[PDB]
Amino acid sequence: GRDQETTGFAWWAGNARLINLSGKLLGAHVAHAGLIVFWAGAMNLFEVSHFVPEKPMYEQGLILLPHIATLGYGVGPGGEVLDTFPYFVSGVLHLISSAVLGFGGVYHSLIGPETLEESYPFFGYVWKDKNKMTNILGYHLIILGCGAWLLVLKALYFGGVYDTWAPGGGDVRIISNPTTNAAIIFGYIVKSPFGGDGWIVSVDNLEDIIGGHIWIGTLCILGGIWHIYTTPWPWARRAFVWSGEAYLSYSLAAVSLMGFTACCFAWFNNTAYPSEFYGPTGPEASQAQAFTFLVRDQRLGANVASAQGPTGLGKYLMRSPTGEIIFGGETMRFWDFRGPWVEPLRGPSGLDLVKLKNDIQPWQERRAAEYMTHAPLGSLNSVGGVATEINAVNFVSPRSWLATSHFCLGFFFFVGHLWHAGRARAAAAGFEKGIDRVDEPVLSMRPLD
Amino acid sequence: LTYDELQGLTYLQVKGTGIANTCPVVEQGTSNVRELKPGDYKLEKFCMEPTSFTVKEEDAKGREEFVKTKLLTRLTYGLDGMNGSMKINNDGSVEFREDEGLDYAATTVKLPGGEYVPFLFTIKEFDGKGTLDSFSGDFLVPSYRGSTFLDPKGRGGATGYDNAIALPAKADADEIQRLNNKSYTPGKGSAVFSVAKVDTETGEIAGVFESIQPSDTEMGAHPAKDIKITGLWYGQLT
Amino acid sequence: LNGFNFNQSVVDSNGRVLNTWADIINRANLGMEVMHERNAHNFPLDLA
Amino acid sequence: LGHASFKDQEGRELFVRRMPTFFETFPVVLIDKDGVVRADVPFRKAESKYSIEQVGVSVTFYGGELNGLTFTDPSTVKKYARKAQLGEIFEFDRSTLQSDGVFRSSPRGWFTFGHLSFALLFFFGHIWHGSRTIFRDVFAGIDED
Amino acid sequence: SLTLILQLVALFAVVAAGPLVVVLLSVRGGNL
Amino acid sequence: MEALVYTFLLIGTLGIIFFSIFFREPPRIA
Amino acid sequence: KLPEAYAPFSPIVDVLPIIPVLFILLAFVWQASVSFR
Amino acid sequence: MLTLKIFVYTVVTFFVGLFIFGFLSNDPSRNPGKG
Amino acid sequence: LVDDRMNGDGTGLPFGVNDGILGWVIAGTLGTIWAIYFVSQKDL
Amino acid sequence: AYGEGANVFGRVTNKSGFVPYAGDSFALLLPSKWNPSDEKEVDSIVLRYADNFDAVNNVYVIAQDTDKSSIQDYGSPEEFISQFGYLLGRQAWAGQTVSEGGFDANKVSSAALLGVATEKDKKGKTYYKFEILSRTADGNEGGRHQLVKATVSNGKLYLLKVQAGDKRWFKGTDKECLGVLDSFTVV
Amino acid sequence: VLNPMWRQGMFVLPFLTRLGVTQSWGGWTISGETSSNPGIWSYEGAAA
Amino acid sequence: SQIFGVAFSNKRWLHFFMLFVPVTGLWMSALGVVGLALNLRAYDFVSQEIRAAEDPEFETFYTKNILLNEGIRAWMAAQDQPHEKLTLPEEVLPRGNAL
Ligand code: CLA
Ligand code: CLA
Ligand code: CLA
Ligand code: CLA
Ligand code: CLA
Ligand SMILES: CCCCCCCCCCCCCCCC(=O)OC[C@H](COP(=O)(O)OC[C@@H](O)CO)OC(=O)CCCCCCCCCCCCCCC
Ligand SMILES: CCCCCCCCCCCCCCCCCC(=O)OC[C@H](CO)OC(=O)CCCCCCCCCCCCCCCCC
Ligand SMILES: CC1=C(/C=C/C(C)=C/C=C/C(C)=C/C=C/C=C(C)/C=C/C=C(C)/C=C/C2=C(C)CCCC2(C)C)C(C)(C)CCC1
Ligand SMILES: CC1=C(/C=C/C(C)=C/C=C/C(C)=C/C=C/C=C(C)/C=C/C=C(C)/C=C/C2=C(C)CCCC2(C)C)C(C)(C)CCC1
Ligand code: OEX
Ligand SMILES: [Cl-]
Ligand SMILES: [Cl-]
Ligand code: NA
């Protein structure tokens, strides 16, 4: 590497020393990609080795085995695991690919070309070359469009993706006729983010999921070709700061928005994150508590429709803010919860009193593991449910884990976006190091009063 | 909307639109009313939604008037899913008798002047005697709160403090209305119904009602006002 | 995600619960728990 | 009013547990000579064998205004037990001064509070003044030396 | 347990691998 | 009065901070 | 669990997640070795 | 009550449009520094 | 019902609009600001 | 105190979570987590243990001097538990209420029978076993599970009564409550 | 009727009442009648 | 001055304020703990408690805090102060609904 006396950056800012070094920058990127794939393979092998087959895939602290299981690799009808060989194959393939990527990153970091323009003009790039940066962005956009179309191919032709909304409690269901309706997809993307709708966490079916993926893959490929064959317009030139730090800040803001968004998928979505693999969401186990106590107390003999609580609102059933019949407990906030074990019990007006009395299914009754433990409580050092629970059961929800972690890292990346956006603006302006001390701007301004 | 096209809608279409709080109507029926076949009936899905909430407050000068009010609680006031019997005779005498369902709804309404009036809109345990043109009766009105309800100071009925815990020198014969009584004795209300727009082919009646019932006495501290509830009701005869 | 839960972490050779400052904090926490929303709960386990 | 003495239904003298100073309010319990809880004014009033109306305790009184007035049936027993958790039961006139209901502090407590607060404030004052009198040359100026 | 013994030896092999690389580059020349 | 005194004190504090922001002494020496 | 041909390598697998945590600390070792120049 | 929503939507759209087009209108050149 | 309500809470309304007038005033306000900026850009 | 070395490489002496107790012609495995408490609700209680976490989870046995020779002479087990509808706790509230929800008129508590048995252990004397779900109008702990194992050996009725809130019962205290239930053997 | 404003030493309330304001924000009216909507012009509204 | 409205103009006053604020805060808290040493606590608001005593409708967050403090005391004293020997049964301890 280099020292501070030449680069001007200290050791705790050493990665800035390779801002203008294309080959070393590429080597750092490839080594980091090797790190990501190494974590994927190693953590996959760890979760496979620490997998007990009789338990569901959430009492064991497994977060990414559900990610493979959602694709339909080794998943039975009801949600059983059948075999762990696809998970093992994924882990081993990731480990070997990470070995290759780590070798390439180490090579380009240590003995690769220091700067790429003098020998490899296709890969050489200056940060002020807008056409070259849009070319690289177009290559990556086409790659991401192919990646989304890969999931589309898996859903459509390779007999995959697990549907929770399939009758009987879900099944690995090959998806036919995905909804490619532009009105539906963009009404998903432009709607309110609050409780009534949810902006992006509202997908209740794999048909809309795969239609949106078709749209995003086609758009990404087309935008990649567009960026390959265009140059940014003068309004974009006047609006953006064209430097490697500013581009990083743009990526940081976008990826922090993605981190918050993924935290919200993890907490609320039960379609792209099946309950059989990720445990209950926030709204369920709370809806399940009211549902199971309703069916238990009507199994004893007491009617649930005409039973009122201490406040006179209904111990089991009440009305929502809109006239829908919902569960009468404190779970009136979670009345928007849609689950595979609720919808056949639910009708047009409300919760279908007659269906609650007669048309309850034994599998919906057996789905009380949702309620029993596994409500997304759990404490930091494991232990059971609420903070006042005793050391009885070893469980924290995977949804809780990868929602909390993802919100933390999303907020940190928003902070990093702020830092890098400010420093990029100060670098383009010329005062990243401070004030010139002989002509400061303040002395050229009139005093406020 | 009639019952035929309400069942033709999905849950997501009705959700958030206010349709689920509306009782069904009859469009293909007849207004003859008396054409209904006599016999013993077991009606189900007895619907009952209101159209106005008027509260009787008595001025201190001696005349009787009701006033229109503003609702504070959103669309939780309808009655749905009830069932019972109607012994209709050939002349027109009925034996309407509600048994079980969502036969209550806790409703809070605001009087002019800014005073909150909570009440429990019930039709539970109601018997109906009269002709098809008009039949009335009485229904049971519960308290509003159960005996396990605690006040802001923790005092209550079945469970609670029954004592001014805030201050150890005030439990004399002035807080008896607030501490010692804690009454939850049910009241009764009178409702009058009317049958209009009868249906012959599938036995679907949808008339109007006017109900009188006491308001909430909170915990027995102050006397209850009278709430007049008018609206539409709906039923299917089998 | 909550805080540390060290309730009944200290047990003796026979398995009896030895009390702890964390256990005293737990008693205060559950005393707070039974007071919160005295009328807003219909079911035992507080999830919503 | 006298010494409120409580007896069980079969007959044994219960005692109301007195309130400590830390408690703004205290549960009303009546426990045995041996030290076992025998009755209370329960909060839940739907369980066990300790509510007053089913244990059947009676308060007798042996003092000035109440010397042989025994109360056994109504909630006056619970009221006298709650008054007995505060010590000896006394009759109070709360209409002459329009009394509050909450307990006030003694002149002893007010004197102690004022003097401890003044004592810490004067500890700070002494520290500041000792600082100022040891460091007079630097509190005024050392003149570039 | 022998499983724990192999876990410890693999842990020591992977923990000591990095500092071994650093000390080997320190004693076998430079360019780091 | 009870609420009137609280409102008067709050708007007095708000008026004080408004005067401090706008009708302050102009800053001198740095 | 791992397949039967990979069961003896599961104890080796049990250590593999912590290597990325070891990598940033390796970077700190290298900075210490170059004396934080 | 619908007109309140219309007025608020107009106000919010106005302020958001001012925000977006003001940041479009040569914001990186609004500096005292030489560059 | 006892009152008139907007009944627009939920149902996934695009940008929250339930009538065409809201979308039209949004588009008109954005277009007016864009027109002012466009005819008045580049300082001069 | 006497000097002895610390426990290193000496394993653990208790993992079953049950400690034996031998009393006056009765024996039972108490939960190891639970601790004794001197709170005699009924005067016939001779032993009482309660959970350190939540004292609703409690167990006690009564030694009531009795006349009937064997537990079968108490009639049907239903007739027996009708006699013992006093150690559940009668309601201290007498006001009128039809607003509790899912309860009889003017009532704030209910008990539902879920088990009736005549189990035997070693000698031939039968053990009346019962499970009762007690639902109180407030809904505390979601109800309480009363498991009763009663018999008479010489002339004294021995009745186990372990209590468990429905909140804790669903978490997994069922194993310990049933362990006490099956371990109550009157010798 | 029996404890009117002039028996309570009210000085500016008769002058407020004389020109139209009768009900307050507390939901009462000096005439003993049931209070309709006071609007912004109640006693306390005029004072504010 | 253009962000907050007010700003420091003297380093003397800036650093004296930085010294002054935590010392004054800690001294006020010390005086409060001295007041608590004799149980001279600002526990209640008499007007609020009388209002809520004569009104079953009047509730504030302060009343909620008072109710929470009662539960802290009742459920904490038995295991907190072993000298007091508080063998209080569970029914006299206060509870809400269902928890
Ligand atoms: C994602 C982590 C990461 C990555 C990929 C990099 C990558 C890089 N850093 Mg960097 N760094 C990091 C974190 C990282 N850093 C952190 C956290 C700090 C703060 C402590 C620094 C501080 C820092 C400084 C001060 C400098 C760098 C520099 C460099 C570049 C060249 C290093 C060099 O030339 O000297 C050689 C380094 C070594 C010989 C030791 C590394 C040994 C190898 C490469 C890795 C360990 C073995 C590995 C397992 C081999 C894999 C085997 C394979 C077959 C799979 C390089 C591209 C230099 C630079 O900016 O270039 C101008 C520079 O001076 N970094
Ligand atoms: C046309 C040229 C080209 C192509 C195809 C790529 C492709 C890629 N680059 Mg790269 N790059 C390029 C030019 C190109 N780059 C240039 C000129 C530079 C400047 C030196 C860079 C600098 C650069 C950096 C710094 C990094 C990359 C990285 C990556 C990878 C990111 C995708 C990923 O890992 O996520 C997952 C992949 C998917 C979701 C795709 C799924 C697989 C599909 C099915 C294959 C697509 C096949 C498709 C038909 C072929 C594409 C056609 C092509 C003309 C675009 C990816 C494979 C990153 C990396 O190192 O990753 C290892 C990274 O850090 N590139
Ligand atoms: C993919 C995102 C990304 C990228 C590529 C960069 C890249 C860069 N950053 Mg940056 N940064 C980011 C995100 C990113 N940052 C975020 C999210 C934050 C907010 C936390 C920051 C805050 C930040 C600051 C304050 C600075 C940089 C700096 C730099 C430059 C030198 C980095 C270096 O060598 O430091 C060396 C790296 C280390 C010493 C290791 C960091 C150790 C961290 C602080 C402890 C946490 C690690 C621990 C394992 C995680 C715990 C859990 C976590 C959730 C808290 C470099 C170009 C420097 C700069 O401005 O140069 C121009 C600098 O001053 N960054
Ligand atoms: C340390 C000296 C001291 C002590 C121990 C006492 C003690 C006592 N005094 Mg006394 N008093 C004192 C000095 C003292 N006084 C002085 C110097 C004066 C002259 C002003 C008085 C005048 C006086 C009168 C007229 C009365 C008493 C009364 C009483 C008794 C009632 C309790 C009480 O004081 O109310 C409560 C005490 C407090 C609430 C202390 C206030 C706590 C801090 C210091 C307030 C903070 C000030 C704050 C920043 C200002 C903003 C508030 C603003 C919004 C209004 C009590 C035993 C009463 C009595 O019983 O009649 C005989 C009585 O009416 N005192
Ligand atoms: C008998 C004790 C005593 C005496 C004789 C002094 C004397 C003096 N002090 Mg000192 N001080 C004391 C106690 C005392 N102090 C205590 C207890 C504290 C801690 C709170 C301090 C903290 C203190 C500081 C920080 C400073 C002094 C300063 C000074 C010097 C002059 C400044 C001045 O008073 O202007 C006039 C003071 C005022 C106009 C104060 C306004 C009135 C206050 C806010 C309210 C008064 C309350 C009430 C009316 C009186 C009742 C209090 C009584 C019951 C104790 C002076 C020689 C200053 C110095 O060092 O000199 C350069 C200085 O800055 N003192
Ligand atoms: C849109 C803008 C958003 C900001 C608007 C809100 C900011 C409010 C302005 C701060 C208060 C002004 C302080 C006056 C005091 C004042 O003006 O002193 C003036 C002082 C300037 O001091 P100098 O530097 O001039 O000191 C040297 C002098 O000794 C010689 O002149 O300001 C400061 O001390 C620094 C800022 C401290 C500000 C402390 C904040 C206090 C919080 C106030 C909270 C009020 C209660 C809540 C409301 C009910
Ligand atoms: C209800 C459905 C909800 C979803 C639909 C949402 C659609 C959002 C489409 C916005 C995309 C516009 C990107 C421009 C970004 C800034 C370009 C610029 O810096 O622009 C500046 C740039 C500088 O040269 O100029 C230019 O290149 C000119 C290019 C800008 C294009 C102008 C937009 C068309 C103008 C139409 C006028 C609307 C008029 C008023 C209508 C009244 C109806 C009653
Ligand atoms: C540049 C640089 C850096 C970075 C580095 C890196 C990042 C590296 C890497 C690398 C990597 C990224 C690596 C990876 C890897 C991998 C591997 C090496 C592998 C493998 C293989 C094997 C051998 C396996 C086996 C197996 C199987 C197959 C299954 C079963 C189990 C087992 C495990 C046995 C640092 C920071 C230091 C500093 C600065 C400079
Ligand atoms: C796949 C999927 C899907 C789909 C999705 C989508 C389709 C999405 C999208 C989206 C989109 C379509 C987006 C867009 C965007 C854009 C953005 C986000 C932007 C931006 C930017 C900014 C922020 C700016 C700034 C500025 C201004 C303001 C002006 C001046 C300049 C500047 C730069 C400063 C669904 C859900 C269906 C299903 C499931 C899955
Ligand atoms: O609301 Mn307030 O708060 Ca969250 O927990 Mn469940 O619900 Mn209620 O409880 Mn505790
Ligand atoms: Cl609840
Ligand atoms: Cl609360
Ligand atoms: Na409660």
CB B139 within 8 A of CB B128: no
Q: Which residue's alpha carbon is nearest to atom 39 within ligand 1?
A: E32
Single out the residue of A103, A248, A90, A41 nearest to residue G20, CA to CA: A41
Single out the residue of B218, B220, B194 nearest to residue B206, CA to CA: B194
- Of the candidates B159, B163, B164, which has its C-beta nearest D45's C-beta? B159
DSSP state of K31: T
Residue A141 CB coordination number (10 Å)? 21
Q: Which residue's alpha carbon is nearest to atom 21 within ligand 6?
A: L8
Subunit contact K34:B114, Cβ cutoff 8 A: no
* Phi–psi pair at J98, nearest 5 degrees: -125, 15
Strand partners, B213: B227
* Alpha carbons J177 and J179: distance in angstroms, whole number: 5
Quick one: which H or E segment has residue J162? Answer: strand J156-165
- Of the candidates G2, G34, G36, which has its C-beta nearest A48's C-beta? G2
Strand, helix or coil at D46?
coil
Contacts of H20 (CB under 8 A, 6+ apart): none
- Of the candidates A187, A321, A322, which has its C-beta nearest I12's C-beta? A187
| Interface residue of J60, J138, J144 to substitute, partner L, most L CBs within 10 Å | J138
CB I2 within 8 A of CB B52: yes
To the nearest 10°, report the CA torsion of A358, A362, A367, A372: 80
* Alpha carbons A273 and A399: distance in angstroms, whole number: 9
Q: How far lies C39's CA from each of A330, B147, B221, C28, J138, in Å?
A: 10, 11, 19, 20, 9
* Alpha carbons A231 and A143: distance in angstroms, whole number: 20
Q: Which two tokens stand for residue L86?
A: 């508080």
- Does the C-beta of H6 come closer than 6 Å to ligand 7? no
CA nearest K33 in B: which residue? B59
Distance from CA of B152 to the nearest CA of D (A): 15
Residues of L in contact with F21 (CB under 8 A): 5-6
* Alpha carbons L52 and C44: distance in angstroms, whole number: 28
CB J48 within 8 A of CB J59: yes
Q: Which two tokens stand for residue A28?
A: 């750092």
Strand, helix or coil at A78?
coil
* Alpha carbons A70 and C12: distance in angstroms, whole number: 45
Residue A190 at interface with chain I, using a CB cutoff of 8 Å: yes
Q: How many residues does chain D have?
A: 145
- Of the candidates I6, I17, I29, which has its C-beta nearest H17's C-beta? I29
Residue L32 at interface with chain B, using a CB cutoff of 8 Å: no
DSSP state of J176: H
Ligand 9 mean position, distance from CA A185 (Å): 13
Residues of C in contact with B149 (CB under 8 A): 39
Angle (CA) C11-C16-C22 rounded to 5° is 50
Angle (CA) B75-B81-B86 rounded to 5° is 125
CB B104 within 8 A of CB B76: no
Strand, helix or coil at A176?
coil
- Of the candidates A311, A322, A346, which has its C-beta nearest B145's C-beta? A311
Pocket-testing residue among L4, L6, L15, ligand 6, by greatest number of atoms within 8 A of Cβ: L6
CA nearest H8 in I: which residue? I22
Output A414-423 pairs: Cβ under 8 A, ≥24 positions apart. Answer: A414/A252, A414/A253, A414/A256, A416/A252, A416/A256, A417/A249, A417/A252, A417/A253, A417/A256, A419/A249, A420/A245, A420/A246, A420/A248, A420/A249, A420/A252, A421/A246, A421/A249, A421/A250, A421/A252, A421/A253, A423/A245
J and A touch per CB criterion (3+ pairs under 8 A):
yes
Q: Which chains have 3 or more CB–CB distances shorter than 8 Å to chain E? A: G
* Alpha carbons J77 and J66: distance in angstroms, whole number: 16
Return the residue matching tokens 């006040």.
B151
Return the residue matching tokens 């001390």.
A437
Single out the residue of A216, A261, A287 nearest to residue A409, CA to CA: A261
Return the residue matching tokens 């009534």.
A196
Could you tell me the end-to-end alpha-carbon distance of chain I, in angstroms, rounded to an integer?
A: 59
Subunit contact L97:A310, Cβ cutoff 8 A: yes
Angle (CA) B144-B145-B147 rounded to 5° is 135
- For every residue of chain B, DSSP letters joined together read -BHHHHHTS-HHHHTTTTGGGSPPB-SS-BS--TTSPPEEE--EEEEEEEEEEEEE---TTS---EEE-EE-S-S---EEEEEEEEEE-SSS-EEEEEEEEE---EEEEE-TTS-EEEEE---TT-EEEE-SS-EEEEEEE--SS-TT---TTS--SSSS--S-TT-TT--STTSTTTTT------EEEEEEEE--SB-SSS-EE--EEEEEEE---TTTTSPPPEEEEEEEEEEE--
Subunit contact D43:L92, Cβ cutoff 8 A: yes
- CA D103, distance to chain mean position in Å, is 8
Subunit contact J138:D49, Cβ cutoff 8 A: no
* Alpha carbons H35 and I15: distance in angstroms, whole number: 40
Quick one: which H or E segment has residue D137? Answer: helix D136-140
* Alpha carbons A12 and A29: distance in angstroms, whole number: 18
Q: Which amino acid is at A77?
A: P
- Of the candidates G6, G10, G20, which has its C-beta nearest A38's C-beta? G20
* Alpha carbons L40 and L28: distance in angstroms, whole number: 15
Which residues have any ligand 3 atom within 6 Å of their CB?
A: A 12-16, 248, 252, 408-409, 412-413, 415-416, 419, 423
The alpha carbons of chain E give a radius of gyration, in whole angstroms, of 14
Residues of L in contact with B154 (CB under 8 A): 67, 70, 94
Composition of chain A by helix, strand, coil, percent to 5: 55, 0, 45
Parallel, antiparallel or unpaired: strands D29-31 and D13-16:
antiparallel
3-class DSSP string for chain C = CCCCCCCCCCECCCCCECCCHHHHHHHHHHHHHHHCCCCCCCCCCCCC
* Alpha carbons A110 and A296: distance in angstroms, whole number: 67
Atom of ligand 4 nearest to the CA of D110: 5
Strand partners, B25: B2
* Phi–psi pair at B48, nearest 5 degrees: -160, 100
* Alpha carbons A385 and A285: distance in angstroms, whole number: 12
Single out the residue of A240, A346, A329 nearest to residue A287, CA to CA: A329
* Positions of E strands within chain H: none
Residue K3 at interface with chain B, using a CB cutoff of 8 Å: no
CA nearest A7 in G: which residue? G37
* Alpha carbons G1 and A47: distance in angstroms, whole number: 8
Residues of J in contact with B185 (CB under 8 A): 95-96
* Alpha carbons A59 and A395: distance in angstroms, whole number: 6
Quick one: which H or E segment has residue E3? Answer: helix E2-15
Method in brief: cryo-EM
| Interface residue of G24, G33, G35, G37 to substitute, partner E, most E CBs within 10 Å | G33
Q: Which two tokens stand for residue B60?
A: 């201190």
3-class DSSP string for B24-37 = CECCCCECCCCCCC
Residues of A in contact with G31 (CB under 8 A): 11, 14
* Alpha carbons J90 and J111: distance in angstroms, whole number: 11
Q: Which amino acid is at A439?
A: D
Q: Which amino acid is at J106?
A: N
CB A326 within 8 A of CB A350: yes
- Of the candidates G2, G19, G36, which has its C-beta nearest A88's C-beta? G2
DSSP state of J63: E
* Alpha carbons A403 and A268: distance in angstroms, whole number: 10
Residue J38 CB coordination number (10 Å)? 11
- Using left for φ > 0, alpha for ψ between -120 and 50, and beta otherwise, residue B12 falls in alpha
Chain L, residues 14-53, CB within 8 A of chain F, namely 47
Strand, helix or coil at D15?
strand
Residues of G in contact with E32 (CB under 8 A): 30, 33-34
Contacts of E12 (CB under 8 A, 6+ apart): none
Ligand 12 mean position, distance from CA L63 (Å): 9
Pocket-testing residue among A125, A134, A137, A143, ligand 2, by greatest number of atoms within 8 A of Cβ: A143
Residues of A in contact with I13 (CB under 8 A): 191-192, 197
* Alpha carbons H10 and A379: distance in angstroms, whole number: 46
Output A296-302 pairs: Cβ under 8 A, ≥24 positions apart. Answer: A297/J102, A297/J135, A298/A356, A298/A357, A300/J112, A300/J133, A300/J135, A302/J102, A302/J103
Strand partners, J112: J133
Q: Which residue's alpha carbon is nearest to atom 13 within ligand 9?
A: A189
Strand, helix or coil at J77?
helix
Which residues have any ligand 5 atom within 6 Å of their CB?
A: D 121-122, 124-125, 128, 132
Ligand 2 mean position, distance from CA A305 (Å): 60
Q: Is the dihedral of CA L58, L62, L66, L71 positive or negative?
A: positive
Quick one: which H or E segment has residue J119? Answer: strand J109-120
CB L87 within 8 A of CB L64: no
Strand partners, B232: B49, B208
Quick one: which H or E segment has residue J144? Answer: strand J144-152
- Cα atoms in the 13 Å half-sphere on the side-chain side of B7: 5
Strand, helix or coil at A76?
coil
Residues of A in contact with L99 (CB under 8 A): none
Q: Which amino acid is at D128?
A: W
Q: Which residue's alpha carbon is nearest to atom 4 within ligand 1?
A: A28
- Using left for φ > 0, alpha for ψ between -120 and 50, and beta otherwise, residue B101 falls in left
Residue C42 at interface with chain B, using a CB cutoff of 8 Å: no
Residue A373 CB-density burial (10 A; 0-12 exposed, 13-18 middle, 19+ buried): buried
* Alpha carbons B48 and B128: distance in angstroms, whole number: 15
* Alpha carbons J107 and F17: distance in angstroms, whole number: 61
Q: Given in angstroms, what resolution was this structure solved at?
A: 2.8
* Alpha carbons A378 and A385: distance in angstroms, whole number: 5
Parallel, antiparallel or unpaired: strands D13-16 and D6-7:
antiparallel
Residue F21 at interface with chain L, using a CB cutoff of 8 Å: yes
CA nearest B219 in A: which residue? A311
Pocket-testing residue among A114, A139, A222, ligand 2, by greatest number of atoms within 8 A of Cβ: A139
Quick one: which H or E segment has residue A105? Answer: helix A85-110
Q: Which two tokens stand for residue L68?
A: 């929470």
* Alpha carbons J95 and J104: distance in angstroms, whole number: 14
Pocket-testing residue among D97, D110, D112, D113, ligand 4, by greatest number of atoms within 8 A of Cβ: D110
